[PDB]
Design a protein around this ligand. Structure first.
Ligand SMILES: [Mg+2]
Ligand SMILES: [Mg+2]
Ligand SMILES: [Mg+2]
Ligand SMILES: [Mg+2]
Ligand SMILES: [Mg+2]
Ligand SMILES: [Mg+2]
Ligand SMILES: [Mg+2]
Ligand SMILES: [Mg+2]
Ligand SMILES: [Mg+2]
Ligand SMILES: [Mg+2]
Ligand SMILES: [Mg+2]
Ligand SMILES: [Mg+2]
Ligand SMILES: [Mg+2]
Ligand SMILES: [Mg+2]
Ligand SMILES: [Mg+2]
Ligand SMILES: [Mg+2]
Ligand SMILES: [Mg+2]
Ligand SMILES: [Mg+2]
Ligand SMILES: [Mg+2]
Ligand SMILES: [Mg+2]
Ligand SMILES: [Mg+2]
Lengths: 177, 135
RNA sequence: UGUACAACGGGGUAUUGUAAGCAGUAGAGUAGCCUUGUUGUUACGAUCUGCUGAGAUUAAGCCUUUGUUGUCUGAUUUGU
RNA sequence: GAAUGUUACCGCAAUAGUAAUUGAACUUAGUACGAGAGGAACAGUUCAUUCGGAUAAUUGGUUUUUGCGGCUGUCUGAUCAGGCAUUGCCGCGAAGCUACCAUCCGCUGGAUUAUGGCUGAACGCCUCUAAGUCAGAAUCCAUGCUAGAACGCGGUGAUUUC
RNA sequence: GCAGUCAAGCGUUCAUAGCGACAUUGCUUUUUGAUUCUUCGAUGUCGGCUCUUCCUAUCAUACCGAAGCAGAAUUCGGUAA
RNA sequence: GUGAACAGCCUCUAGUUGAUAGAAUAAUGUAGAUAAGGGAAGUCGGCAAAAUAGAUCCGUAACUUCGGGAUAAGGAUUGGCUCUAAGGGUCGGACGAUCAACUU
RNA sequence: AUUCAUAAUAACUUUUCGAAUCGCAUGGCCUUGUGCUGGCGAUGGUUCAUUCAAAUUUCUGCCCUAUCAACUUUCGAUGGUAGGAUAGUGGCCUACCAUGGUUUCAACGGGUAACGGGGAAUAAGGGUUCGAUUCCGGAGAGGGAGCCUGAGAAACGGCUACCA
RNA sequence: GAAACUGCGAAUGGCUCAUUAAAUCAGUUAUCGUUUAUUUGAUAGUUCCUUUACUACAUGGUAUAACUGUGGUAAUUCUAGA
C-alpha cells in the first residue's frame, strides 16, 4: 500500500510506496492512533515513530476513528463529523465508511510522525513550510508574541509583501476585538 | 489464515472447526462446536451462560491484568520555516530582548505621533480653504 | 528383577456449566415484638450475588507418570 | 485343522480372481466448411457422472459414558444424598461405530481385430496377399492388485537331563 | 419374430447411397398354435421387489469403412457384449 | 400420594422374590429407540411408523330430519414463589362473639 | 362568568433572560491622564401586546341502498376518579370502577365510474342534471410507516426502513 | 471580491383528485382549552461574595471550514490522514 506521511512540526508531507507483505504487515490489526516503531517498515525509517491517523481502502472509502472493525459498514452520519459534509440544515445521510483497523484492503495509510528517527527523510525533514496565515484577533497577536495589555498591536500584526510589477505592496489583516 | 471467534461463546475457532450459519437477513454466525450451535438454536442468551466470554465480561470475572496495565509515553521536537520567514528571521526576531523592543517601539511610537498631529492640521487646512475657497 | 508389569494416586486431555457449605442493609412481600427505627430487630420467602469456568466425570479400546503398593518357574507335549 | 524330525522367522508364485466408467466446461474458435443460416475436432486445462477400495483430521448421525446438568410423581422425618417409574422424561454430551450426509486413493507396457497401407507375384500389365510386411480398438496378454496349492517350493534361526 | 437371393420399381437424372414389388431360399424358439413324451400317493399360478450370471439380432460408449458425407446433424456397414 | 378417577406411576398392611445356570456380545433376528437434507419420490394402497392429545379462555363453515354437524376448524394460556379479593356455620340483641373449610 | 389580569409570603432550579456584536460620524469638557464624556442606527434580547398563522371546537346541512335491523366493548365501546402524555381540552393513553352509547325521526353495514364549496347547464313557475377543472377549504407526492431540522413539516424537487 | 463559516429561506409556490359519506366542506360558533418565526407597539440600574489586602471588563477560552499539502475508489454533490 501507499503511506501518506506528514511531519507536522515542519508542516511537511510526502508519500511512500511499500510493496512487501512483511514490511506492511507491521500495520495490521493496528488501529487509528496506535503508534508504530519505524525500522520494521524500512531501514530509512529506523527509529521513526508513526501515529496512524486514517486513510482509504480501494474503492476509496475513508476510515473513521472509533468504529473498531477491519471491515466496511454503513452508518447514519450527522452534522459535525468525519467522512460527511451535510448539504442542508439537519440533513443526515446513511453512507459507507471503512473501519479504523488497518487491513491490506487499504489503498493508503495516513501516518503522522511523532518521533524523528536516526536518519533524515528528504521531502519531510529536509524541507520546511511556512504557516500560511498569522494572528488576526488582538490577544492572539498578544500571545503569538507575548506582549502585555501595554505593548499596542498595530506594529506587531504580520505584513505580507506582494508585487504589481514595479509596485511592490504590503498587506496586513485588520485587527479584531 | 484467520482464527474466527465463536459468536455465542467468544471461543477461538481454528480452520475447519465447527460450523457457519447464514441467517435470513444475512447475519453470519459461527459456532466453535455443536454445543454453542445448539444453545444458539434453543435461543439461549450468552450473557446467562457462565462459561462464555460474554457472561464473563458482563460479570467482571477475570480482568485484573487490565486494572494493573497503566502509563507509558514519549514525545515531540522542533522548528520549520514559514515562507517569507526562514528559520533565521525566526531566530533573529525571537532572540532580540525587550530593551530593543522598547527602543524600536518608542521610536516608531514617537515617529508617527508626528504624522497624526500633522494630518490633523492638514484637516483644518482643507477646511479654512473650504470655509473660504471663493469665486 | 526390567528403560518390567499391574493396581492405585498424580499431571495432561475431554464433557457438563458453576458443587456442598458458609455469607450478604440482594429479594415481590406477609406477619409478630419491641427501646418505634439518620441501617430497629424476629419468623417465613421462589430466587439472586460471592467464595466458583466451580464441582462431578474422564479408558472402560484417551495421553502421560522420578510417587504408593504388589507381582515375577503352575500344566502339557515335542527329535532328523 | 491331524500327518510328513521339532519349532521359528523371511520369502517364491503355479493356479484362480481382477476394474474402472461416462459426461461437460474452458481453450482450440466463432476457426476449418459454408452464399448465408450455421458450425466441428486433435493437443492442453478445470470439473463432474456411475462404479470401486479404504478411511474418520473435520462436519453430521447414534448415546447405558446412564458422563454433567435440568424436570414431573412417589418413597427414605427434614437437610445432604439417593431409590422406584421395564433405559421415567428433557438439553448437552466425549469415545466407538459410521454417511456421495464426510474425506482420501483408483497403474502402464505389449500383442492384436476391423480397417487403411508397404513391398509383391500369380497374369512381363495390374493388385494390401498368395510368400513377406507397416499402422491399428472400450479387445486380449502382461505390469499392477487380492488369495496363496491346507498332498507346490526356496532361504534362514534355534534345536531338550531331568 | 429376424436375415437373404433375383432386380421391375423408388430415389429430379441414376436398379442396388438409402430402399425395393412379383416371386424365392432360409434362420430363430422370449409370439401363438399343433402334439400329448414326463409329472395327477403332487414339480406351489401372474406381477413386482432383491441379486447373480449368460446370449447378441448393439441403444450408448472405443476404432473404423459407406453416403444422395461441404460444415453441423444423421443414416448404412465392420471389429465389438 | 398424585389426579377427574376403582387410570397410570410411587408407597403401607399382607404376600412374593418361583419359573436352569455361567462366560461372551459375530452375522441374522425378535422386541424397544434415534436419525442430517428432502418429505410418500416408497407401495396395490401411507401398510408400519410419526404427528395430535389434559385443562382454562377465546373462536368455530357447508349442510341439517333444527336434535345436530362440533373437541368442526383455528388460536392464546399452563411451573415456582409472594401476596390480594370473594365465596359458610353456630350462638347472644345493622352490628357483636365463636368455630370451620377448601375453592375461584 | 373564573382560582382572571396583577401583586404579597416561604422556598425550589444540572438556572432562562439581563449586549464580551456591527456601521457611519468625530464633538464636547478639565484637575490635560489620549481622562471622563458624547451624535445618528444596525443586529440582537426577556416578558406583554399586535399582526401572519395554527390546533382543536358549538349549532344545522350530504348521493344510491333493507336482496343491510339491530349496531357498539379482539385489543375503549359510553361515563366517573387519578395519573401519564400533549402546545393544550378530551378514552388521547394507562390504571381502578361502573354498565353504559346509537337505532324505523333508518342506526350499523354495503355501494359510489364521491374530494367539499363558490358555481355550471336547462329559461313560465315548481324542478332536473352537473361541478376532476382559473377562487376558498381539504388531501397526496409509486405504496405504507417512522423521524431529523425547525417558529412551523409527521415534508417527500428532506432523511430512515420495509414493499413494488 | 471567489471560496467557506454564520444567518435566513427551502413548511410559500406549482400540480393532481387517489383516498374520504357525519369525514371533509359551508354558513354559524368557542378558546374561561392552547402553540405561534415574523411585522408593529411596548418592556430589563439588582447578575460577583464570608462582604479590607480581590473577581480580565481597557473586553476571558479553543476548535474548525474554506485554504495548504499528502491520499483512497470503475463509479455520486464519497471523502480519510496531516
Ligand atoms: Mg467582530
Ligand atoms: Mg470583534
Ligand atoms: Mg475627541
Ligand atoms: Mg428583533
Ligand atoms: Mg376519565
Ligand atoms: Mg390533554
Ligand atoms: Mg355492556
Ligand atoms: Mg343497549
Ligand atoms: Mg330508508
Ligand atoms: Mg375518487
Ligand atoms: Mg371541485
Ligand atoms: Mg358532487
Ligand atoms: Mg376523478
Ligand atoms: Mg375551519
Ligand atoms: Mg406516478
Ligand atoms: Mg412524507
Ligand atoms: Mg418531483
Ligand atoms: Mg415540495
Ligand atoms: Mg402492499
Ligand atoms: Mg446558510
Ligand atoms: Mg475542543
Amino acid at each position: 500500500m501507499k503511506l501518506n506521511i506528514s511531519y507536522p512540526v515542519n508542516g511537511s508531507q510526502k508519500t511512500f510506496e511499500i510493496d512487501d507483505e512483511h514490511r506492511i504487515r507491521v500495520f495490521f490489526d493496528k488501529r487509528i492512533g496506535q503508534e508504530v516503531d519505524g525500522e520494521a517498515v524500512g531501514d530509512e525509517f529506523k527509529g521513526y515513530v508513526f501515529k496512524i491517523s486514517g486513510g482509504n481502502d480501494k474503492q476509496g472509502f475513508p476510515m473513521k476513528q472509533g468504529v473498531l472493525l477491519p471491515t466496511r459498514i454503513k452508518l447514519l452520519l450527522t452534522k459535525n463529523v468525519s467522512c460527511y459534509r451535510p448539504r442542508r440544515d439537519g440533513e443526515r445521510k446513511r453512507k459507507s465508511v471503512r473501519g479504523a483497523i488497518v487491513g491490506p484492503d487499504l489503498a493508503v495509510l495516513a501516518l503522522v510522525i511523532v518521533k524523528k528517527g536516526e536518519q533524515e527523510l528528504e521531502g519531510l525533514t529536509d524541507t520546511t513550510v511556512p504557516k500560511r496565515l498569522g494572528p488576526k484577533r488582538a490577544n492572539n497577536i498578544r500571545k503569538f508574541f507575548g506582549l502585555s495589555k501595554e505593548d499596542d498591536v498595530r506594529d506587531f500584526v504580520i505584513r505580507r509583501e506582494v508585487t504589481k510589477g514595479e509596485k511592490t505592496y504590503t498587506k496586513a489583516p485588520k485587527i479584531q476585538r | 489464515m484467520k482464527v474466527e471467534i465463536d459468536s455465542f461463546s467468544g471461543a477461538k475457532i481454528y480452520p475447519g472447526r465447527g460450523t457457519l450459519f447464514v441467517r435470513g437477513d444475512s447475519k453470519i454466525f459461527r459456532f466453535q462446536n455443536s454445543k454453542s450451535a445448539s444453545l444458539f438454536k434453543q435461543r439461549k442468551n450468552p450473557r446467562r451462560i457462565a462459561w462464555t466470554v460474554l457472561f464473563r465480561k458482563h460479570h467482571k470475572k477475570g480482568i485484573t491484568e487490565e486494572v494493573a496495565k497503566k502509563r507509558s509515553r514519549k514525545t515531540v521536537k522542533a522548528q520549520r520555516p514559514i515562507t517569507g520567514a526562514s528559520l533565521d528571521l525566526i531566530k533573529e526576531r525571537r532572540s532580540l530582548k525587550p530593551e530593543v523592543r522598547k527602543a524600536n517601539r518608542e521610536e516608531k511610537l514617537k515617529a508617527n505621533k508626528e504624522k497624526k498631529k500633522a494630518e490633523k492640521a492638514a484637516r483644518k487646512a482643507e477646511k479654512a480653504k473650504s470655509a473660504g475657497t471663493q469665486s
